């Protein structure tokens, strides 16, 4: 079977402008494992991105965490670009500090 | 510690 990933883009700690933080993009519940995940700053692919080791839930659906150290500003906009086989086109999730 | 099949 094939399942489409669920996508969450959030911060490790509460958004504080001008303070070092972590930008997280959590992709979960997808199958197969092959997935493409990108962090975006102002529409530019973030360069230093790390990810968790591949794991899966009780239902064999996979989950990954892509993270990067970032410093939130008021002007700068952040997003997560995920590409999967279950997606006709790469899905983009904008980052909301309130979520 | 892991298990390994025979």
């Amino acid at each position: 079977i094939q399942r489409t990933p669920k996508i969450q883009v959030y911060s490790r700690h509460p958004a504080e402008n001008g303070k070092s933080n972590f930008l997280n993009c959590y992709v979960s519940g997808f199958h197969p494992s092959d997935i493409e995940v990108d962090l975006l700053k102002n529409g530019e692919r973030i360069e230093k991105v790390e990810h968790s080791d591949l794991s899966f839930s009780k239902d064999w659906s996979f989950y990954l965490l892509y993270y990067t150290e970032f410093t939130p500003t008021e002007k700068d906009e952040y997003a997560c670009r995920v590409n999967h086989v279950t997606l006709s086109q790469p899905k983009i999730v904008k980052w909301d500090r309130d979520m | 510690k892991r298990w390994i099949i025979l």
């Binding site: 669920k6 997280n24 199958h31 197969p32 | -």
Partner: protein, 275 residues
């Protein structure tokens, strides 16, 4: 309370690109403690938690040998499943393995686990008596016959009842500071005005462990499951978890809505309102 040890395994064949990709992780409760990736130049099982780093060379040597050994069996097994299902070599397939044990407060084995999935679906699973198998189809039933003849269930039962539980209790003890201790969620309720007439209420649980938590919204003591946006529990990135529950309410009627938070770290369930 009760604690669990789990090892997760995934092999995915890569037609044309090369040999199958193998990745495995180890979890004690909700704490990742080991990992192996076949994509590494000189792959080895590496420590992802502090309390596992104590183990000596023979441990990391034996573990790495096991991980390399499992990857190779996964190749053999992937090829076999091709012939079972009469599938093409051109297609990429996934094989997934999980085995573990659950213990109680007394350090006694509650149950033992060993499951295998092919292309994301259940293939064959070891039953709770640790002496029987559940097969998904005629292909898994073929495997069931082989494994019964090879006494794989008796192999696993010995490990699950013995070496699994012992080492789990060891890990639990070695990292008792972090493992046994439960972090309560930092909780607050936020207010988000959608329109002049409507606002959104979001209930937050941050930095808690383990992942097991319950967030609910109530309208006048009544439950709002239908109209609650409940996101999946997410890792904060520091071995802790985050989760929020949101409801939309009419402006000026926030006092009608309460957020109820139930976690292990909390002495008693919490009730929150926007302030």
């Amino acid at each position: 309370g009760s604690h669990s040890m789990r090892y997760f395994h995934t092999s995915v064949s890569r037609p044309g690109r090369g040999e199958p990709r193998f990745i495995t992780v180890g979890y004690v409760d909700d704490t990742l403690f080991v990992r192996f990736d076949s994509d590494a130049a000189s792959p080895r099982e590496e420590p992802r938690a502090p309390w596992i780093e104590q183990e000596g060379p023979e441990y990391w040597d034996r573990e790495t040998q096991i991980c390399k050994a499992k990857a190779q069996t996964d190749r053999e097994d992937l090829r076999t499943l091709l012939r079972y299902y009469n599938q093409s070599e051109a297609g990429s397939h996934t094989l997934q393995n999980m085995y573990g044990c659950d213990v109680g407060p007394d350090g006694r084995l509650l149950r033992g686990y060993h499951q295998d999935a092919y292309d994301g679906k259940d293939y064959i699973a070891l039953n709770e008596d640790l002496s029987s198998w559940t097969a998904a189809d005629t292909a898994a039933q073929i495997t069931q016959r082989k494994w019964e003849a090879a006494r794989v269930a008796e192999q696993l039962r010995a490990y699950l009842e013995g070496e699994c539980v012992e080492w789990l209790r060891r890990y639990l003890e070695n990292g008792k500071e972090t493992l046994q201790r439960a972090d309560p969620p930092k909780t607050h309720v936020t207010h988000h005005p959608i329109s002049d007439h409507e606002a959104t209420l979001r209930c937050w649980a941050l930095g808690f462990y383990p992942a097991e938590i319950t967030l609910t919204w109530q309208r006048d003591g009544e439950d709002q499951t239908q109209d609650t946006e409940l996101v999946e529990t997410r890792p904060a990135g520091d071995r802790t978890f985050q989760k929020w529950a949101a409801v939309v309410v009419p402006s000026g009627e926030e006092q009608r809505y309460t957020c109820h938070v139930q976690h292990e770290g909390l002495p008693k369930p919490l009730t929150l309102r926007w302030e």
